[PDB]
Design a protein around this ligand. Structure first.
Ligand SMILES: *[C@@H]1O[C@H](CO)[C@@H](O[C@@H]2O[C@H](CO)[C@@H](O[C@@H]3O[C@H](CO)[C@@H](O)[C@H](O)[C@@H]3O)[C@H](O)[C@H]2NC(C)=O)[C@H](O)[C@H]1NC(C)=O
Ligand SMILES: *[C@@H]1O[C@H](CO)[C@@H](O[C@@H]2O[C@H](CO)[C@@H](O)[C@H](O)[C@H]2NC(C)=O)[C@H](O)[C@H]1NC(C)=O
Ligand SMILES: *[C@@H]1O[C@H](CO)[C@@H](O[C@@H]2O[C@H](CO)[C@@H](O)[C@H](O)[C@H]2NC(C)=O)[C@H](O)[C@H]1NC(C)=O
Ligand SMILES: *[C@@H]1O[C@H](CO)[C@@H](O)[C@H](O)[C@H]1NC(C)=O
Ligand SMILES: *[C@@H]1O[C@H](CO)[C@@H](O)[C@H](O)[C@H]1NC(C)=O
Ligand SMILES: *[C@@H]1O[C@H](CO)[C@@H](O)[C@H](O)[C@H]1NC(C)=O
Ligand SMILES: *[C@@H]1O[C@H](CO)[C@@H](O)[C@H](O)[C@H]1NC(C)=O
Ligand SMILES: *[C@@H]1O[C@H](CO)[C@@H](O)[C@H](O)[C@H]1NC(C)=O
Lengths: 729, 206, 729, 208
């Protein structure tokens, strides 16, 4: 156009809101959606909606309901209020149970305050909640709680809940509870943090607080004492109101009891069969156990003939952890995603008693995940369409043929949609397809029987009418060939991009192991503003170590974090600037977390290509980060393993080379992930050398710096730094 | 003359993997006496009648006894699978044998151990990556190599024992997980009576 | 013209250094002086010298001698090595003792490592050291030590040493030991920190440390529980090597035991008479006790009729604490500086058992300190000459006729020397005069009998020759009138200063209670470089709250800190701008500690006078600072005292007004004085209101940021902030 | 009837500032029988003979007894200064009196207290801004106004006691400081025997 542009206020105040359609399947043909603060039910076949629960029915509760959970039988709703956040997924709150058909709030034997977790059984209206690191179970929402565990100790023993390193780098969740399908068994893990050292930092809180507060969390850094894990399964049907409950412990396989290990995956198969994945501390060896319930002794028996070893000799196991199994309806076979000897992750069909599997999928591409398993079909997401690793499409394969694969999403709108997310219903009767880009998000509803796109849920045409009178930037996704291998880049170009004029280049970088910054997803981000308003070329590059391109590219950074993936961004800038439309004297680089570590290593690399750079909460020394993440790619910091490279990779080593670049160092004082210690050691090295730089701390902010006021401040501050460094009025 | 039935009914009974064995030759037995001293709940014999074994002439009469919970009676049966037969005790069926699972009267000068205990796992972890888990099963009438780890019970259910195997047993390291079962109102025993013949005019008579 | 300017690298690398003449009087006619690392003894009357200790007599120790202390009889020298700084005055080190007579190192019964404090007796070679918070006494340097106390407990009980609040705000020293004049008695204080809350902060240490340390210091904030104090005296001659030593307790007067109180001064009068000064927690009421020893019982005796009461109705007592007494030889009378009925501090003459005292000096000026007392003359320093409160001169007054006062330093070199300090010999036969400015420092030696100048000890003519190559700035010390009252200011004028040309002005500020930033002291500082090289006028101003001018100007900010001292700095900058040599569009303000508080309160006032400002380790909320200092001027932060003024005077309340200025906030992470909490709450208030600002943290730096690398980094960072705000190349 | 001295021999004896006072009328005594029960270390009389004290007919007989360490025997001497004479006990010489410093062997049935204790300071605070400190000394043979502060020993040395006074008690704030003395091997006591005579009513004659 020749009018309005995407400004910094549009991104900070969310002027152009993207509509979403988030539904919760209740059955095989009825789903729940919230509109006008009214919880409704949409019959998948007719589309006819109905009022499930309205808005004014809670205008007398006197509390701010933060979330809600409806039991799988629809007879109760779990109301959550007094939400208080902890880490990325953990939080405690207060709960109440409102009966639906009786329309009365249950008042007997209420859920106690400060409840750490609560979950329904997958079928029915049974409840299990964690409180004071101890598990409780209510067979019915109006009867007294049954106490399962008695060893709950704060920061020491965890029952049914995860510690820090398991919540963040293993399970990606706070819950360590696992119901059996039909509600009979409740499998729970136990974590022991006795000899795990504690990270300590200050929380200053509100002005009213006279003395600051010291936060102490068990945090296993690189090479420190990791926690230990036990596994238990309890029968939730034979609870006794006069005797304590009894838990049966499942021991890790003998190949895991000889050293440090992790419980990394729990997956129920039948209703008397459960699969546990274990991973050694050196995460190059994992073995999966399969355990059946023994009615005679009441125990659980796992046979060695049912063990499946998933190891690797050039790297680790899995993308971030070994994949989960998808069993058949009888529990004698399953499907998992593993490398295919050439390095590409495809689906393998396993027999629970035969250690060898047969790959039902092959090619120079990767399966992203397994979404549904029917008696006839097996649906999966992949990046196979047009050979682009940055795309996602839904696929269908026949259980009998293995050669009749059908692109269920590709070419439904190929000019607008190349990134898909599917949400199946119960029994995989229907499914919702979520298109994330390159166009506006598109929500479609289908029917798995004959692929009948019956309804369109959200076309986001309301956001389209607004974006016509603004000068939106374009998004190019292409590739380059270095060392005879194809590496992908992506660029956000200013509107009315002239191919001959020189442009400022901001190199956005994460470059983490198994990362992907070049995709087809549509975003209204800070890069949108820098390209639309400031006319800056925002570019990313997936190099050695980026995922979804075979284990050949991904494992290039094994035991060498801070070498290849850093030089990729450097030499790419040589390739970027040589394209002719880039000001080879105004090239910046900015990153967060691992990306901040890369930006720091690049600015101190003496490459002479980058002018300035910003690093937000960066890693500085791998011995400062946690053990599960770091040791997966770095091993152990001992003079026998990879300590020599542990010391050869710190940002502080490159202190004297920061005399040639402008440097903006940002870090939140309450960061539980990348502790402030990391940035404090960077500044201490730059000061002791004689390097001037800009610094900015954010009081009581975490790894996200995502508080409403702090998020606007950090992006306003980085905008000033970029505009000054590029000499842009 | 009189056979010493006494060592079975004094002190604390050993565990399944730590069973004691009485071998008898040149003596006279009163088998109908010892069965009455207990509350017998199973008298299973193979190759001989339970009544015929109380009245016969044998060269050797061996008896293996141990503390065995009645709830685990499914795992002391012939051809049975489970940790009992694989890593603890497997009955030998080379000679006529009888199997007696009996509970003892309140006062029999026998002490109830802290709890019942059997081994859950007894494998040899070895290989070029310590990746081949080789479970070590016992021969019938033999002792498990994991017996030495804790021959008089376990401190609690799940105790992981570790030691190195010598070059005599080869391989790498032996790991063994134990299991604990609570003690019931009374203590429950288990006997395997084996009898042999041979043309040595016998010697063990009623 | 073609000359060089005083650069930032000259100030940072100490290119031009002031020579001093530090002497230690060992007698009435001899003093010690180190020259070329040789310790020389000089004869005052004549000037001949001899070598006392050679610059090579300690070269075979392998140690680096950090400091030394020669015993008063000259028989031993205490060597101090392995120095580790704690707070402002406290530290820890090892101690070797060298016998000067035997010319060998004392190796029997060595002083233990981690010794907290060592002190000789004032005469002889007795030693008292504090180790593990317990006091030990050595009669001879190579004999076993007597243990005086056994109650020493880290962070709980302090014997012979001070806690943080007593070291910082009461005694200004780590030592709590006070020998008797001839070494017979050892008087010490005991501090109990049982219920004192702890300030906690992280210390990151060197890069090799994997987990940060958490420093815990007993630190009483405003209104918090204060430490308790006890006083004891022990006879160092009756020390048996078979029975524990006995310490006599001197209790505080009954008017102090009724509530919380402090011990603020210890002064020995005779060999059997000691004078203690106690102070209530409400620091407008102090009591002086006089205690005599009797050898009949062995205990002490403080007559009630010998107590003295110094109280204030306009504010607090003394400048920071009550002044110390100066007793006559018999110890039955003393001279003390107290405030008169007009609020001016002059010398009163007390009889130990006569409640009324006689003022021997009067006028609209103040006595700074009593320096010597003979049987005929009393020597003191005052700001009377030419009515300048920023000057210092030595006066003597006849005790037979108080009208006979004589100035010994007014007319010596009145254009070069206006700020004097004096060092008298024993029995006051000679005195060294120390001139501080406004010219180069000048050190002379005189005799008291005829006030005859003996010789010039140091004239700094070596530096003078060097300083003529460089264009040095000048200094103007004048006054302006506000509400019919003279208020003094000083200005560092650039070289070749032009009354017709306009200059940018930087306001240097502290403005604390009883402060004085306008004086005649010569200083080579950052302001010298900013004026010589950047042609910036650097001004300071002593408004209401400043000292040495009467209580009406000083006790004006009583119970209202952050009010008139902030307004008067702004009013001074207004009056400076009406002058024709100040660009009223390029005015800045910077400060440290209280100056940071004033700078921040000024920048958030909305006056629109200042363009930018720098706050270094500022106080932000008076409930965050320690109790002794804060409650002295503000009171108790209680609804029944002055909590309303406690909350009306925060920097956080003025966050919105920072949108008008460019603000730079600097603070060290390891600040035990003004905790990083204070700047953490300022930055949080600016972020939650939309104010952009520049920041800088210094890892593991204290309230001084005085490490060589850090001190150079902050003054280089602050220089660029000013040169960009003043638009300087 | 006979004057019994049981409270001097049973129970735990009080401190010097809380001395118990027995007064005997219309009874008979055996003074030498009680001194035999102890190992006396001092028996100084004033106004009466150390022998005639045991043989005289008296109008009344009063005894002040308390726990007292032998290490502080100089502070109880006649005319002594110090904390004992000022804030604890001062012997009265209005009547003939004897002073006894005795050690009780384990043969007796009285128990050792936790420690010895006297008062270091007992003063009154009043006036403008609570500025007037008037030290409260005792008349001979009287109790300190600080006795009610701790009537069963001091918990620690240097214990500070403060409490508002009534108008009958003078007024102001009463401030007191206690001193604690370590307990000896045996029990050491202090007895102050005084004698009052009457014109014709001497009915506390001795036992024969
Ligand atoms: C979580 O793990 C800790 C250890 O990391 C467990 O605490 C340990 O408990 C055992 C059992 O008593 C103790 O170890 C040994 O105790 C004996 C005394 O019986 C002692 O002589 C040995 O030297 C050894 O310490 C000990 O109390 C303790 N060990 C520690 C803390 O290092 C704890 O039980 C575990 N929690 C669970 C499994 O729920
Ligand atoms: C330091 O002060 C504390 C607090 O007054 C003293 O501890 C007290 O000691 C007695 C013991 O019964 C009681 O007054 C309190 O119960 C104690 N308080 C606490 C907090 O423990 C301690 O004795 C003092 N130490 C010294 C050496 O004087
Ligand atoms: C010290 O200052 C305090 C507070 O400024 C004053 O104490 C006041 O004393 C009067 C009379 O005793 C009371 O009526 C007031 O309530 C007190 N003020 C407060 C805030 O409580 C007094 O000027 C000084 N006190 C002394 C002992 O000198
Ligand atoms: C929607 O369809 C379902 C189908 O079972 C029906 O039960 C419900 O009453 C319908 N609601 C409306 C409003 O038509
Ligand atoms: C499923 O639920 C039924 C209840 O009727 C229960 O009997 C059965 O054991 C469950 N199935 C399992 C545990 O596999
Ligand atoms: C053997 O035991 C039986 C038990 O019923 C008894 O009747 C019989 O007399 C016994 N014979 C012996 C001890 O010889
Ligand atoms: C100065 O000379 C005199 C002359 O005898 C001598 O006694 C004295 O010790 C000398 N002083 C010094 C410090 O050398
Ligand atoms: C008094 O006591 C003495 C003890 O020495 C005894 O000899 C005497 O008989 C007693 N007199 C009496 C009990 O009357």
């Amino acid at each position: 156009d020749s009018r309005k542009t995407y400004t910094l206020t549009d991104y900070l105040k969310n002027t152009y809101r993207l509509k979403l359609y988030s539904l919760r399947w209740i059955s095989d043909h009825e789903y729940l959606y919230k509109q006008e603060n009214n919880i409704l039910v949409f019959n998948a076949e007719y589309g006819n909606s109905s009022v499930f629960l309205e808005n004014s029915t809670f205008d007398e509760f006197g509390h701010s309901i933060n979330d809600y959970s409806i039991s799988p039988d629809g007879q109760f709703i779990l109301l959550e209020y007094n939400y208080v956040k902890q880490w990325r997924h953990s939080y405690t709150a207060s709960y109440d149970i409102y009966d639906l058909n009786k329309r009365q709030l249950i008042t007997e034997e209420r859920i106690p305050n400060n409840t750490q977790w609560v979950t329904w059984s997958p079928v029915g209206h049974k409840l299990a909640y964690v409180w004071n690191n101890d598990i409780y179970v209510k067979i019915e929402p109006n009867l007294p709680s049954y106490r399962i565990t008695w060893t709950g100790k704060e920061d020491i023993i965890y029952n049914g809940i995860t510690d820090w390193v398991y919540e963040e780098e293993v399970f990606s969740a706070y819950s360590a509870l696992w119901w059996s399908p039909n509600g009979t068994f409740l499998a729970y893990a136990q974590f022991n943090d006795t000899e795990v050292p504690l990270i300590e930092y200050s929380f200053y809180s509100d002005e009213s607080l006279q003395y600051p507060k010291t936060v102490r969390v068990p945090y296993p850094k690189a090479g420190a004492v990791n926690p230990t894990v036990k596994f238990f399964v309890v029968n939730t049907d034979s609870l006794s109101s006069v005797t304590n409950a009894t838990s049966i412990q499942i021991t890790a396989p003998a190949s895991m009891l000889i050293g440090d290990h992790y419980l990394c995956d729990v997956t129920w198969a039948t209703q008397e069969r459960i699969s546990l994945q274990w991973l050694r501390r050196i995460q190059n060896y994992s073995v999966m156990d399969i355990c059946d319930y023994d009615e005679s002794s009441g125990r659980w028996n796992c046979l060695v003939a049912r063990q499946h070893i998933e190891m690797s000799t050039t790297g680790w196991v899995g993308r971030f952890r070994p994949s989960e199994p998808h069993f058949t309806l009888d529990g004698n076979s399953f499907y998992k995603i593993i490398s295919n000897e050439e390095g590409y992750r495809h689906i393998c069909y396993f027999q629970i008693d035969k250690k060898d599997c047969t790959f039902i999928t092959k090619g120079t591409w990767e399966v992203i995940g397994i979404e549904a398993l029917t008696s006839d079909y097996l649906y999966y997401i992949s990046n196979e369409y047009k050979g682009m690793p940055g795309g996602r499409n839904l696929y269908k394969i026949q259980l009998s043929d293995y050669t009749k694969v059908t692109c269920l999403s590709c070419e439904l709108n190929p000019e607008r949609c190349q990134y898909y997310s599917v949400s199946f219903s119960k029994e995989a009767k229907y499914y919702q397809l979520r298109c994330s880009g390159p166009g506006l998000p598109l929500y479609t509803l289908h029917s798995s029987v004959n692929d009948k796109g019956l309804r369109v849920l959200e076309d986001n045409s309301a956001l389209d009418k607004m974006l016509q009178n603004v000068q939106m930037p374009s998004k190019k996704l292409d590739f380059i060939i270095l060392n005879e291998t194809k590496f992908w880049y992506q660029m956000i170009l200013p509107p009315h991009f002239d191919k001959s004029k020189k442009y400022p280049l901001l190199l956005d970088v994460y470059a983490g192991p198994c990362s992907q910054k070049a995709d087809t997803v549509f975003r209204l981000n800070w890069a949108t503003y820098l390209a639309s308003t400031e006319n800056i070329i925002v570019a990313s590059f997936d190099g050695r170590g980026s995922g979804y391109q075979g284990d050949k590219i991904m494992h290039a950074i094994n035991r060498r974090l801070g070498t290849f993936e850093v030089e990729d961004q450097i030499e790419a800038a040589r390739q970027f600037s040589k394209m002719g439309f880039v000001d080879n004297k105004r090239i910046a680089i900015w990153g967060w977390s691992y990306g901040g570590y890369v930006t720091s290593m690049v600015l101190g690399s003496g490459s002479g290509v980058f002018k300035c750079g910003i690093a937000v909460a960066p890693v500085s020394r791998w011995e400062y980060y946690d053990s599960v993440y770091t040791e997966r790619y770095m091993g152990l910091p001992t003079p026998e393993d990879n300590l020599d490279h542990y010391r050869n990779s710190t940002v502080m080593s490159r202190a004297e080379n920061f005399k040639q670049v402008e440097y903006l160092l940002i870090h939140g004082t309450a960061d539980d992930n990348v502790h402030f210690q990391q940035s404090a050691q960077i500044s201490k090295a730059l000061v002791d050398v004689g390097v001037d730089f800009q610094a900015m701390w954010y009081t009581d902010e975490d790894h996200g710096i995502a508080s409403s006021t702090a998020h606007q401040h950090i992006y306003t501050h980085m905008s000033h730094f970029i505009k000054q460094c590029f000499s842009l009025p | 003359k009189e056979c010493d039935f006494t060592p079975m009914l004094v002190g604390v009974p050993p565990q399944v993997y730590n069973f004691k064995r009485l071998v008898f030759t040149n003596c006279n037995y009163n088998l109908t006496k010892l069965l009455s001293l207990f509350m017998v709940n199973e008298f299973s014999c193979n190759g001989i009648s339970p009544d015929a074994i109380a009245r016969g002439c044998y060269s050797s009469l061996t008896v293996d006894y141990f503390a065995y919970p009645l709830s685990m009676r499914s795992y002391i049966q012939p051809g049975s699978a489970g940790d009992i037969s694989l890593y603890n005790y497997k009955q030998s069926f080379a000679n006529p044998t009888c199997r007696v699972l009996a509970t003892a009267p309140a006062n029999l000068t026998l002490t109830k151990p802290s709890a019942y205990g059997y081994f859950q796992k007894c494998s040899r972890v070895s290989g070029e990556h310590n990746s081949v888990e080789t479970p070590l099963y016992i021969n019938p009438g033999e002792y498990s190599i994991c017996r030495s780890f804790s021959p008089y019970g376990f401190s609690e259910d799940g105790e992981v024992f570790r030691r190195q195997l010598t070059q005599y047993e080869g391989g790498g390291i032996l790991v063994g997980v134990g299991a604990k079962l609570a003690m019931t109102d009374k203590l429950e025993m288990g006997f395997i009576i084996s009898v042999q013949y041979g043309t040595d005019t016998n010697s063990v008579c009623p």
